[PDB]
Design an enzyme around this catalytic site. Sequence first.
Site, PDB file in Angstrom:
ATOM      1  N   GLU A   1     -20.025 -28.018  17.412  1.00 39.78           N
ATOM      2  CA  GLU A   1     -19.487 -26.928  16.533  1.00 39.78           C
ATOM      3  C   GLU A   1     -19.189 -26.795  14.980  1.00 39.78           C
ATOM      4  O   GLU A   1     -19.678 -25.614  14.040  1.00 39.78           O
ATOM      5  CB  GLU A   1     -18.284 -26.337  17.389  1.00 39.78           C
ATOM      6  N   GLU A   2     -18.104 -28.032  14.860  1.00 42.21           N
ATOM      7  CA  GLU A   2     -18.077 -27.667  13.815  1.00 42.21           C
ATOM      8  C   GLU A   2     -18.800 -28.170  11.962  1.00 42.21           C
ATOM      9  O   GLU A   2     -19.552 -29.201  12.306  1.00 42.21           O
ATOM     10  CB  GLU A   2     -16.551 -28.696  13.492  1.00 42.21           C
TER      11      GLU A   2
ATOM     12  N   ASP B   1     -11.948 -20.816  22.529  1.00 40.00           N
ATOM     13  CA  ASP B   1     -11.854 -21.466  21.303  1.00 40.00           C
ATOM     14  C   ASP B   1     -10.384 -20.805  20.398  1.00 40.00           C
ATOM     15  O   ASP B   1     -10.344 -19.950  20.802  1.00 40.00           O
ATOM     16  CB  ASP B   1     -12.479 -20.881  20.485  1.00 40.00           C
TER      17      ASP B   1
ATOM     18  N   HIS C   1      -7.580 -26.260  11.712  1.00 36.48           N
ATOM     19  CA  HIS C   1      -7.112 -26.848  10.365  1.00 36.48           C
ATOM     20  C   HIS C   1      -6.778 -27.583   9.247  1.00 36.48           C
ATOM     21  O   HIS C   1      -7.189 -28.024   8.404  1.00 36.48           O
ATOM     22  CB  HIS C   1      -8.729 -26.331   9.367  1.00 36.48           C
TER      23      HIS C   1
ATOM     24  N   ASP D   1      -8.303 -26.251  19.112  1.00 39.06           N
ATOM     25  CA  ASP D   1      -9.160 -26.320  18.306  1.00 39.06           C
ATOM     26  C   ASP D   1     -10.618 -27.289  18.709  1.00 39.06           C
ATOM     27  O   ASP D   1     -11.137 -28.471  17.999  1.00 39.06           O
ATOM     28  CB  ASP D   1      -9.335 -26.249  17.111  1.00 39.06           C
TER      29      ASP D   1
HETATM   30  C1  PBD Z   1      -7.815 -19.212   8.651  1.00 37.18           C
HETATM   31  O1  PBD Z   1      -8.682 -17.787  10.102  1.00 37.18           O
HETATM   32  C2  PBD Z   1      -9.877 -17.834   9.463  1.00 37.18           C
HETATM   33  C3  PBD Z   1     -10.734 -18.002   8.441  1.00 37.18           C
HETATM   34  C4  PBD Z   1     -12.223 -18.663   8.810  1.00 37.18           C
HETATM   35  C5  PBD Z   1     -12.795 -16.775   9.399  1.00 37.18           C
HETATM   36  N1  PBD Z   1     -13.707 -16.637   9.428  1.00 37.18           N
HETATM   37  C6  PBD Z   1     -14.932 -17.284   9.862  1.00 37.18           C
HETATM   38  S1  PBD Z   1     -16.834 -16.712   9.954  1.00 37.18           S
HETATM   39  N2  PBD Z   1     -14.329 -18.732  10.507  1.00 37.18           N
HETATM   40  C7  PBD Z   1     -15.035 -19.002  11.505  1.00 37.18           C
HETATM   41  C8  PBD Z   1     -14.245 -20.088  12.277  1.00 37.18           C
HETATM   42  C9  PBD Z   1     -15.612 -21.099  12.991  1.00 37.18           C
HETATM   43  N3  PBD Z   1     -14.417 -22.433  14.169  1.00 37.18           N
HETATM   44  C10 PBD Z   1     -13.851 -21.678  14.899  1.00 37.18           C
HETATM   45  C11 PBD Z   1     -13.335 -22.973  15.158  1.00 37.18           C
HETATM   46  N4  PBD Z   1     -12.958 -23.813  14.095  1.00 37.18           N
HETATM   47  C12 PBD Z   1     -13.565 -23.033  13.613  1.00 37.18           C
HETATM   48  C13 PBD Z   1     -11.824 -16.462  10.005  1.00 37.18           C
HETATM   49  C14 PBD Z   1     -10.363 -16.294  10.080  1.00 37.18           C
HETATM   50  O2  PBD Z   1      -9.032 -15.971  10.420  1.00 37.18           O
HETATM   51  C15 PBD Z   1     -10.064 -14.600  11.951  1.00 37.18           C
HETATM   52 ZN    ZN Z   2     -12.598 -25.382  13.972  1.00 39.78          ZN
END
Ligand code: PBD
Ligand code: ZN
Length: 309
Positions: free
Chosen positions: A152-153, A196, A278, A113
């Site tokens: 991004e974050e 990603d 995360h 990530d």
């Molecule tokens: C833990 O599983 C989830 C947690 C949150 C979300 N929903 C959203 S809208 N996430 C935005 C991620 C943005 N991002 C990409 C890389 N680092 C951050 C979906 C998940 O599983 C499908």
């Molecule tokens: Zn992330």
Amino acid sequence: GSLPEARLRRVVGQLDPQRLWSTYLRPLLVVRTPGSPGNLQVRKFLEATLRSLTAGWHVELDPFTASTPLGPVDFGNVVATLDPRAARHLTLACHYDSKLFPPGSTPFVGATDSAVPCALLLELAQALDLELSRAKKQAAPVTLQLLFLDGEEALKEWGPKDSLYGSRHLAQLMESIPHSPGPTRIQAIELFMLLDLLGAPNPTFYSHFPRTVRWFHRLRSIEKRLHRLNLLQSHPQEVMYFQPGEPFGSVEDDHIPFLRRGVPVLHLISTPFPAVWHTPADTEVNLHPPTVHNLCRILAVFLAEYLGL
Ligand SMILES: COc1ccc(NC(=S)NCCCn2ccnc2)cc1OC
Ligand SMILES: [Zn+2]
């Protein structure tokens, strides 16, 4: 247009797994939150690596300062366009920042990530350098563009205003710059493929956008083929990564500012997310190298078929 088998095996043979791991991945695995020295050093590393490619890419920064929960912060997207003369391009994108966490834990380096997505783009550009160079010299009509997006974050909590700093800024910038035929650089993006959350074991991808499902079907067909040809490791079933059918939900990400402006997007993101997502455990030792290389091989074939390399 699928590659003949002998040519497919030669393209896969141009990948260097040690180069990907040591030359492209390892140097990225540092804390690289927006505004940090490590983020600046990763930005310089990406730029200099891209400028060294024999194909002669156009490499430019998109620098800007934005208001954040930490106060003003400077961000810089790295934009590499192989042939700026070309009408249009396949764009591959990922984010090179790492998410900020407060002091007192093991540092977060975001290996999936998105250090792995960044290293994959560098390795694809290097492995297909000769063919990309020769296609540019032939003035091919569709070029390649690589975007390494900053910010991004979220800096302190994900939402419309604390996320996607780099991609919001860059999509607005491209909208403002004429291009021929264009009429702006936004229309030059023939397909925006966002990588990603790559590098964990057992990823699964779904097609998030009906408009680009044909490209998703192509990636599935390439997985199937490489499995058949004994070119994937740790891959006991024919189809594992590219799942049919509907996604489990959409995911906000760096494609959003482009999607909203009418750009076709394919979102190459694992869902479910990596187990380590995360947490400080999103590190090199928790990546699954055979999965990284399988993904690199699928992508290399995709890229060679899409651009006719
Ligand atoms: C833990 O599983 C989830 C947690 C949150 C979300 N929903 C959203 S809208 N996430 C935005 C991620 C943005 N991002 C990409 C890389 N680092 C951050 C979906 C998940 O599983 C499908
Ligand atoms: Zn992330």
